[PDB]
Design a protein around this ligand. Structure first.
Ligand SMILES: Nc1nc2c(ncn2[C@@H]2O[C@H](COP(=O)(O)OP(=O)(O)OP(=O)(O)O)[C@@H](O)[C@H]2O)c(=O)[nH]1
Lengths: 453, 440, 85, 414
C-alpha cells in the first residue's frame, strides 16, 4: 500500500521548508544541489527508494516530485539559482501577479482561485508523469495570509479532485504575532478548511522551535533558514519510513492508521532528540545517551516542537520511530518505564507504538553517543490551547470588527455582513472541534456507544 | 518519383527557401564548393539524399533545384550575392524589375502570366535534365498577394501541364490579430479558392504562433524574420527526412497524401514540432518521449493561433528522427488515447501515423533548438482550422461591407463578382468542414 | 490463473525490489520462484484457494530447505499463519 | 513435389524473407558465400529444394524479392546472408503507391507484374518439383498489400495446382498508423480468399504481446518479431523437409486442416509436453491472436520436432479434448492432426507448432468491417479511390463477401 507522495510548497515559509527538505534528501541520498546524483549509475543496488520522491528522467538525474507555488517570485528565483538544475522550472508557479497585496487569507484564496487552472494543470501533469500515487503533502505556513489562502484553495480543490488520496498537511504556527488579529484570522480560516477537508495535520509552533534553536545552537541570533531546518529534519525523519522502508511501517497510510483514530482527531504533536544533521551538530557526543535516554528525551516536554502546556495531558495514539543501532532489550526497558509514567485513558487499552528504521549508509556516521536518533508523534489535545489563543483573540476583537477593510476585497464576498457571517461560522466550527477534543479527552467518548445501542 | 521540384515565390518564400537550402546544407555539412561536399559520403549525397532536391551534374556538384521568382529586384539582388546563387543555376532564377501590385491585383493578372510560359519551359528543361519526379513543392506566403498570385498561377499551369504528381504548397498565414497590409485578408481569401482547385495538399503556418514559440521556448527577447525562416526550414526538413535519409520505417510522399488528405475536399494538414526549447534548457532538462508526444497537442507547438482542444481529432501523422523505436511512441499513443486530450471521432481515431527516421535533428546556430537525439513532427488534421477560417472570414466579411478600396481591384484585373465567389467558396469550405467534423 | 501469473509478472515493477531487479545478479534469481497455486477448498475465496509453491534446484536444493512434498511443511504452515494474519 | 518457391514483398515481408533464409541456413548449415557446410545428404537435399546449385558449388536461394524501394534491397543485401543474389531473382520498381491497395495493384504493381511473372515462369521451368509458394508480406501497408495480392492472383491464374501459403502480417486494431491500413487490408483479403489456398494469421499487436511477455522487450522492433516468425516458419517447413515419424505436405495440410474449401485462415502458435500443450492452448502464446475460451475450436493440429513421445502427445490430446470439449465441435467429433520429426531443432531439445481454426477470425472480420463502414460513412478517403477507379459498389460487394464468410464461420456457431 506504498505510493508516491508529491510535495506542495506554498508561501515563502513553505518554499523555504521545501528547499531545505530537498537539500536534506539530496545530502542523504547523495544527490547534491545540481540535480545529478552524486552516486554513479553503475551502483544500482540502493537500499533506499527515491522513486516516491524523485522522478528519474535520466539515469543520473533525479527530479524531485514537487511543485512550488508562491506570489513572490524572488524566493522562487533564489531557490532556482541556489539549486542549478535540481528543481524543475515548469513546477514553479508565480502567475506574474506581482507581490502579495497584503497578508490576508481573502487575498490568498483570491490569488488561488484566479489561477486555479494553472496549478491544477501542473498537478495533472505531475500525476500523469507518474504511475503509483498515494497523496500530497501540503505546507500551509499559516503565519502568512497569502500562503494560508493558497493552501486552503489547494485543499478545497484536491478534496473533490482526488478523494481517494490521503492528504497530509503541515501548519507552521508563529510564536509571537506582529499583527495578532490578522494572523489569527488567517490561521482560523485555514483551520476551517483543515477540519473540512484535510485528512492529517501536523502543527509546528515557533516558540519551541526558537527554544530548541537557542539551546542546541551556539549563536544567540536566530535565522529563519536554520529555524526551518528543524521542520526540514522532522519531515525527513517522518518520511524516512517510506524512503528507507523498514519491516513494520512502509506506507504513509500504514503510518497514519495508528495515528488517526477518527477523522475528527487529526492533529498531532511532534518531538525530536537533539538533532545531528543540522548546522551546529558537534555538541551531541558529550551527552552519552542510549535508546532509553532517547525515549526519555522524546517524551520530555523540552524536546517537543510545539507549546506543551502539559496539565495532565490525555494521550490517544503515541508513536515513535528510532533510527540507528537500536537494542530490543533497551526498547523493552524504555516501554516498561514509559507505561508507568505516561497517562493513559481508561477506556482505550492501546499502548505506545515503537518502530525501528535503518540509517543511511552514505550519511556521516556519528559516535556511539548520538549515533541513534528518535522521533515521536503524539495525538495530544494540548494543541487546543494554541488554538484557544487565537480563539480568545477572535472573541475579544470580533466584538468590534477590526481590519474588516482587508478581508472584503479579493474574496467572493465584498460586503461586511458576509465576511462577518463567514468568520462566525469558522469560529463555530473551530469551537465544535475543540469541544470534540475535550470530549474525547474524557471517558464518555467510549461510553456513548455503551449507553446507547 | 525520386525528385521533388521546389519553387520559392514572393519575398517571404524566397527567404524561407534560402534558410531551407542553408539547413539542407548544414545537415549534410555542405559548403559552397562541395563536389559533393566533399565526395566521401554516403549517405550525405549520394546516395539519396541529396538526390531529391539537389540536381546531380556531370562534375558531381549538387545544384539545388530552386526557381526563385519575384518582381522585386532588391530581393533578387539579395539572393544573388550570397553563395546560394552559386549553388543554383543562373538560368533557374527569374528576375523582375517592377513589383506586380499591392498585392494580389497584378500578381494573378495577365502581367504576371507573361512569365508563366517562361518558367514553364524552365521546369520542362529542368525535368528533362534530371530523371523522375515525385511532386511539386511550393513556398510562398499567403500574406503577400504577389507571391500568392504567382504561386497560384504556377500551380494552375503545373496542373494542366502534367497533372500526374501531387502538388505540395507551403503557405504562411499572417497574424489574425494584427495585419500590416490592408488587403492581406483579401489576398488570402482570393487565393484559398485558387489553391482549392489546384493544390492537392496545403500547409498552414502562422507567424504570430511562431513568434510566441521563440519568445517562450527559445526565450529570445527580440524575434526576427530569420528565426521564423529557420523554424520553417526545420519543419520542411522533417517532413522529407525519410526521402533524404533512410530510416527503419521509411515513409513516402504518397504516404502523406494517403494520410493528410482524408476526405473528398480536405487538403489542409496542421504541422507541429516537438520538442522545441532553448539550447540551455535542453542541456538542463531531459524529458521522456511521453512528455514530448503530449507536447505536440499543446496550442504552442501547433503553430496556429487557435486552441486545439476545441478541435475534433482526424487522421494525423507523426515522423520521428534519430533513434526511435515503436513502444515508447506506442505507449505514448496508448496513453494519448486514454487521456482523450483531443475529442476523437468514430471515423479517424485509429489514425496516429508513426514514421521513423535515422537522421537526428540538427540545431541551427542562428535559432535555438532543443538538442535531443529524437524529434517529433506531427502532421495533424484537427478541426481547429475552421476556427481559423471563420476568424479570418469574419474580418473579411466585416471589411467587405465597405472595403474602401474596391475601385482599384475592379479596375486593374478583378471585379466584385470574384470577391463574392471567393467568399461563397470559403463559406462553403467552412460549412463542409463543420459537417464533416460534427457528423461523429 | 494464467492471467493471474501474467499480472504477477507485471507487478515486478510495483514490487519494492526494483533496485535489485535492475541488477543482472538478481535476474532469474527472482524468477526461480515458481508461480504455482495449489487449490485448497471447493469454491472457496481466492485468498483461501491461493497457495505458494516453491521448487528448489541444485546446487541450492542441497543446502536450502523448502516446502518439499515429503517434508513437514514448515515454510508452508508459517506462510499460512502469516497469510491469515 | 518437395521444392517450394518463396516470394517476398511489402515493407516488412522483405525482412521476413531475409530472416527466413537466415534461419534456413542456420538450421541446415551453410555459409553466406554459398559454401556447403551441412552433413551429409539431407542438407544437400534441402539445398536442392530451396537454393540453386551454381558454379563452383555455389548456392543461391530461390527467392523473388519485390518492393517499391531500392533501400529495401540495399538493406536485405547489407544483411548477413544477403550478399549473393542473381539480378533476375529480384526486380524492384519505382517509386511508391502510398499505402493504397488500389493504386498498388493497379499502377505501381501492373508495371512490374509482367517482369515478375516472366521471372517466376523461368523459375518454374527450372524447378521441376515445385509444390508450394510461400508469400511473405504485410497486409497493413497498402503498397505491400496490393503488390502481394496482385502477385498471388497472377500465380493462381498461372499455376492453379500449386499450393499458395501466405504469411501476411495482419494489421492490428490498436496500431493506429493509418485509417486506410485496415481498409486496404480487407480489400486485399476480399481477393485473397479466392486467390490463395492457405493463410496464416500474424498480427502486429499479437507479436508485440508475445515478445513483451516472454522477451520482456521494452520496445518491440520488427527484427526480433521477424526472427521469431522465421523460427516458426523453419519449424513448419522442416516438418515437411526433415525426416520424421510422419511428414505433413502442403496438400496434406489443405486436405486435413480445413473442412470446407471456403475457409483458408489458420491461427498459429509456437512453443516454447504438458507445458507445451498449455502454452499452445493458452492465449498469451498465440500470434493470431485469438482467445481459446471465446472462440469455438473447429479444428486443431499440433506438430512437434525433437524427441517426443507419441503416447505422451496422445494423452495430452485426450486430456485437452476432455477438458475443452465445449470449444471442440461435436461434428468432427474429435479433431487431431499430429506430425512428429525425430530430428532435433536448432538450439532447442524440442520444439512445437500449433495450428487452429476458431471463431475469432470472423470476429476480427467483424471488427475490420465495422471500421471500414464507420470510416467510409462520411466518405473519408474516397476522392483518391474515385480518381484511381475503385467503386463503392465494389466495396459493398467486398463487405458482403466478408459477411458471407462470417456466416460460414457461424454456421458452425460459436
Ligand atoms: N519560523 C519561520 N517563519 C517564517 C519563515 N518564512 C516565513 N515565515 C513566516 O512568515 C511570516 C511573514 O510573512 P511572509 O513570510 O512574507 O509570508 P506572506 O506574507 O504570506 O508572503 P508569502 O509567503 O510570499 O506569500 C512570519 O510571521 C513568519 O512566521 C521561516 O523561514 N521561518
Amino acid at each position: 500500500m506504498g505510493g508516491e507522495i508529491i510535495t506542495l510548497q506554498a508561501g515563502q515559509c513553505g518554499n523555504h521548508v521545501g528547499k531545505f527538505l530537498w537539500s536534506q534528501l539530496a545530502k542523504e541520498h547523495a544527490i547534491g544541489t545540481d540535480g545529478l546524483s552524486q552516486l554513479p549509475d553503475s551502483s544500482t543496488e540502493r537500499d533506499d527508494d527515491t522513486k516516491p520522491f524523485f522522478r528519474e528522467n535520466s539515469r543520473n538525474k533525479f527530479t524531485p516530485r514537487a511543485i512550488m507555488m508562491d506570489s513572490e517570485p524572488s524566493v522562487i528565483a533564489d531557490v532556482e539559482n541556489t539549486f542549478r538544475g535540481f528543481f524543475d522550472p515548469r513546477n514553479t508557479w508565480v502567475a506574474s501577479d506581482g507581490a502579495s497585496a497584503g497578508n490576508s487569507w481573502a487575498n490568498g484564496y483570491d490569488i488561488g482561485t484566479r489561477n486555479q487552472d494553472d496549478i491544477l494543470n501542473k498537478i495533472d501533469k505531475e500525476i500523469d508523469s507518474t504511475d503509483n500515487f498515494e497523496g500530497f503533502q501540503l505546507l500551509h505556513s499559516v503565519a502568512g495570509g497569502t500562503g494560508s489562502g493558497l493552501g486552503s484553495n489547494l485543499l478545497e480543490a484536491l478534496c473533490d479532485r482526488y478523494p481517494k488520496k490521503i492528504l497530509t498537511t503541515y501548519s507552521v504556527f508563529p510564536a509571537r504575532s506582529s499583527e495578532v488579529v490578522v494572523q489569527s484570522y488567517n490561521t482560523i480560516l485555514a483551520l476551517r478548511r483543515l477540519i473540512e477537508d484535510s485528512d492529517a495535520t501536523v502543527v509546528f509552533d515557533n516558540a519551541s522551535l526558537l527554544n530548541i534553536s537557542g539551546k542546541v545552537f551556539r549563536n544567540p541570533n536566530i535565522d529563519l533558514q536554520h529555524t526551518n531546518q528543524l521542520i526540514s529534519t522532522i519531515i525527513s525523519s517522518v518520511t524516512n519510513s517510506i524512503r528507507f522502508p523498514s519491516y513494520m511501517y512502509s506506507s504513509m497510510s500504514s503510518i497514519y492508521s495508528t495515528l488517526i483514530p477518527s477523522p475528527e482527531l487529526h492533529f498531532l504533536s511532534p518531538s525530536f532528540t537533539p538533532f545531528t544533521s543540522d548546522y551546529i551538530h558537534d555538541d551531541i557526543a558529550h551527552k552519552g545517551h542510549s535508546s532509553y535516554d532517547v525515549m526519555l528525551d522524546l517524551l520530555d516536554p523540552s524536546n517537543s516542537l510545539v507549546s506543551t502546556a502539559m496539565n495532565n495531558p490525555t494521550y490517544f495514539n503515541v508513536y515513535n520511530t528510532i533510527i540507528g543501532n537500536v537494542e530490543p532489550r533497551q526498547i523493552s526497558r524504555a516501554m516498561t518505564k514509559l507505561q508507568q509514567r505516561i497517562k493513559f485513558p481508561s477506556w482505550s487499552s492501546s499502548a505506545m507504538h515503537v518502530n525501528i528504521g535503518r540509517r543511511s549508509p552514505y550519511l556521516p556516521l556519528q559516535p556511539n553517543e548520538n549515533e541513534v536518533s528518535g522521533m515521536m508523534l503524539s495525538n495530544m489535545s494540548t494543541v487546543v490551547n494554541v488554538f484557544e489563543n487565537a480563539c480568545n483573540t477572535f472573541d475579544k476583537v470580533f466584538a468590534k470588527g477590526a481590519f474588516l477593510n482587508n478581508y472584503n476585497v479579493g474574496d467572493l464576498f465584498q460586503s461586511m455582513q458576509n465576511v462577518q457571517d463567514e468568520f462566525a461560522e469558522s469560529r463555530e466550527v473551530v469551537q465544535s472541534l475543540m469541544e470534540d477534543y475535550v470530549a474525547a479527552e474524557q471517558d464518555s467518548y467510549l461510553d456513548d456507544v455503551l449507553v446507547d445501542d | 518519383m525520386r525528385e521533388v521540384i521546389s519553387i520559392n515565390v514572393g519575398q517571404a518564400g524566397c527567404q524561407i527557401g534560402n534558410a531551407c537550402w542553408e539547413l539542407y546544407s548544414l545537415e549534410h555539412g555542405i559548403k559552397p564548393d562541395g563536389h559533393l561536399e566533399d565526395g566521401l559520403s554516403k549517405p550525405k549525397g549520394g546516395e539519396e539524399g541529396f538526390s531529391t532536391f539537389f540536381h546531380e551534374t556531370g562534375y558531381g556538384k549538387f545544384v539545388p533545384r530552386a526557381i526563385y521568382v519575384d518582381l522585386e529586384p532588391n530581393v533578387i539582388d539579395e539572393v544573388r550575392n550570397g553563395p546560394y546563387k552559386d549553388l543554383f543555376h543562373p538560368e533557374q532564377l527569374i528576375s523582375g524589375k517592377e513589383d506586380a501590385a499591392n498585392n494580389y491585383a497584378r500578381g494573378h493578372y495577365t502581367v504576371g502570366r507573361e512569365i508563366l510560359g517562361d518558367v514553364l519551359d524552365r521546369i520542362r528543361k529542368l525535368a528533362d535534365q534530371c530523371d523522375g519526379l515525385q511532386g511539386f513543392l511550393f513556398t510562398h506566403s499567403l500574406g503577400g498577394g504577389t507571391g500568392s498570385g504567382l504561386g497560384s498561377l504556377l500551380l494552375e499551369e503545373l496542373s494542366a501541364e502534367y497533372g500526374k504528381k501531387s502538388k505540395l504548397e507551403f503557405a504562411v498565414y499572417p497574424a489574425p490579430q494584427v495585419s500590416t497590409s490592408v488587403v492581406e485578408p483579401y489576398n488570402t481569401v482570393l487565393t484559398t479558392h485558387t489553391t482549392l482547385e489546384h493544390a492537392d495538399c496545403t500547409f498552414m503556418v502562422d507567424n504570430e504562433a511562431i513568434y510566441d514559440m521563440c519568445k517562450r521556448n527559445l526565450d529570445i527577447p527580440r524575434p526576427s524574420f530569420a528565426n521564423l525562416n529557420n523554424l520553417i526550414a526545420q519543419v520542411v526538413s522533417s517532413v522529407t527526412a525519410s526521402l533524404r535519409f533512410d530510416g527503419s520505417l521509411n515513409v513516402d510522399l504518397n504516404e502523406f497524401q494517403t494520410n493528410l488528405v482524408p476526405y473528398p475536399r480536405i487538403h489542409f494538414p496542421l504541422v507541429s514540432y516537438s520538442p522545441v526549447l532553448s539550447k540551455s534548457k535542453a542541456f538542463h532538462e531531459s524529458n521522456s518521449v511521453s512528455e514530448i508526444t503530449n507536447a505536440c497537442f499543446e496550442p504552442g507547438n501547433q503553430m496556429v493561433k487557435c486552441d486545439p482542444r476545441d478541435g475534433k481529432y482526424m487522421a494525423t501523422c507523426l515522423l520521428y528522427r534519430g533513434d526511435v523505436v515503436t513502444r515508447d511512441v506506442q505507449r505514448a499513443v496508448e496513453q494519448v488515447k486514454n487521456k482523450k486530450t483531443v475529442q476523437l471521432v468514430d471515423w479517424c481515431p485509429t489514425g496516429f501515423k508513426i514514421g521513423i527516421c535515422y537522421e537526428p535533428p540538427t540545431a541551427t546556430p542562428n535559432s535555438q533548438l532543443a538538442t535531443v537525439d529524437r524529434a517529433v513532427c506531427m502532421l495533424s488534421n484537427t478541426t481547429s482550422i475552421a476556427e481559423a477560417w471563420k476568424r479570418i472570414d469574419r474580418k473579411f466579411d466585416l471589411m467587405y461591407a465597405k472595403r474602401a478600396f474596391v475601385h482599384w481591384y475592379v479596375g486593374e484585373g478583378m471585379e466584385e463578382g470574384e470577391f463574392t465567389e471567393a467568399r461563397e467558396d470559403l463559406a462553403a469550405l467552412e460549412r463542409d468542414y463543420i459537417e464533416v467534423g460534427a457528423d461523429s | 490463473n494464467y492471467k493471474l501469473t501474467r499480472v504477477l509478472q507485471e507487478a515486478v515493477q510495483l514490487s519494492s525490489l526494483r533496485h535489485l531487479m535492475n541488477s543482472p545478479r538478481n535476474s532469474s534469481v527472482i524468477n526461480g520462484l515458481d508461480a504455482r497455486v495449489l487449490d485448497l477448498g471447493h469454491g472457496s475465496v481466492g485468498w483461501d484457494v491461493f497457495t505458494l509453491d516453491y521448487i528448489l534446484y541444485p546446487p541450492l536444493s542441497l543446502v536450502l530447505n523448502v516446502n518439499r512434498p515429503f517434508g513437514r511443511k514448515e515454510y508452508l504452515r508459517i506462510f499460512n499463519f502469516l497469510w491469515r494474519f | 513435389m518437395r521444392e517450394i518457391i518463396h516470394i517476398s514483398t511489402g515493407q516488412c515481408g522483405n525482412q521476413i524473407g531475409a530472416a527466413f533464409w537466415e534461419t534456413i541456413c542456420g538450421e541446415h548449415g551453410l555459409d553466406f558465400n554459398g559454401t556447403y557446410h551441412g552433413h551429409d545428404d539431407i542438407q544437400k537435399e534441402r539445398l536442392n529444394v530451396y537454393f540453386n546449385e551454381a558454379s563452383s558449388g555455389k548456392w543461391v536461394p530461390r527467392s523473388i524479392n519485390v518492393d517499391l524501394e531500392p533501400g529495401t534491397i540495399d538493406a536485405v543485401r547489407n544483411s548477413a546472408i544477403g550478399n549473393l543474389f542473381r539480378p533476375d531473382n529480384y526486380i524492384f520498381g519505382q517509386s511508391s503507391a502510398g499505402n493504397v491497395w488500389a493504386k498498388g495493384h493497379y499502377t505501381e504493381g501492373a508495371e512490374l507484374v509482367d517482369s515478375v511473372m516472366d521471372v517466376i515462369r523461368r523459375e518454374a521451368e527450372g524447378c521441376d518439383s515445385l509444390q508450394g509458394f510461400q508469400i511473405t508480406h504485410s497486409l497493413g501497408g497498402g503498397t505491400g498489400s496490393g503488390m502481394g495480392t496482385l502477385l498471388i492472383s497472377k500465380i493462381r491464374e498461372e499455376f492453379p495446382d500449386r499450393m499458395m501459403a501466405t504469411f501476411s502480417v495482419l494489421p492490428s486494431p490498436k496500431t493506429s498508423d493509418t485509417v486506410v491500413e485496415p481498409y486496404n487490408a480487407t480489400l486485399s483479403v476480399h481477393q485473397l480468399v479466392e486467390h490463395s489456398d492457405e493463410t496464416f494469421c500474424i498480427d502486429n499487436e499479437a507479436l508485440y504481446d508475445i515478445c513483451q511477455r516472454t522477451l520482456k522487450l521494452n520496445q518491440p522492433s520488427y527484427g526480433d518479431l521477424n526472427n521469431l516468425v522465421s523460427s516458426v516458419m523453419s519449424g513448419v517447413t522442416t516438418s515437411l523437409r526433415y525426416p520424421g515419424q510422419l511428414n505433413s505436405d502442403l496438400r496434406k495440410l489443405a486436405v486435413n486442416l480445413v473442412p470446407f474449401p471456403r475457409l483458408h485462415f489458420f491461427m498459429v502458435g509456437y512453443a516454447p509436453v504438458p507445458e507445451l500443450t498449455q502454452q499452445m492452448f493458452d492465449a498469451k502464446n498465440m500470434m493470431a491472436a485469438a482467445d481459446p475460451r471465446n472462440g469455438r475450436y473447429l479444428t486443431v493440429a499440433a506438430f512437434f520436432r525433437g524427441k517426443v513421445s507419441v503416447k505422451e502427445v496422445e494423452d495430452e490430446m485426450h486430456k485437452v479434448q476432455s477438458k475443452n470439449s465445449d470449444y471442440f465441435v461435436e461434428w468432427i467429433p474429435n479433431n487431431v492432426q499430429t506430425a512428429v520429426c525425430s530430428v532435433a531443432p536448432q538450439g532447442l531439445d524440442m520444439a512445437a507448432t500449433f495450428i487452429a481454426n476458431s471463431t475469432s477470425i470472423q470476429e476480427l472480420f467483424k471488427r475490420v468491417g465495422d471500421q471500414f463502414s464507420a470510416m467510409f460513412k462520411r466518405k473519408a478517403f474516397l476522392h483518391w479511390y474515385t480518381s484511381e477507379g475503385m467503386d463503392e459498389l465494389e466495396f459493398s460487394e467486398a463487405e458482403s463477401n466478408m459477411n458471407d464468410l462470417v456466416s460460414e464461420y457461424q454456421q458452425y456457431q460459436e
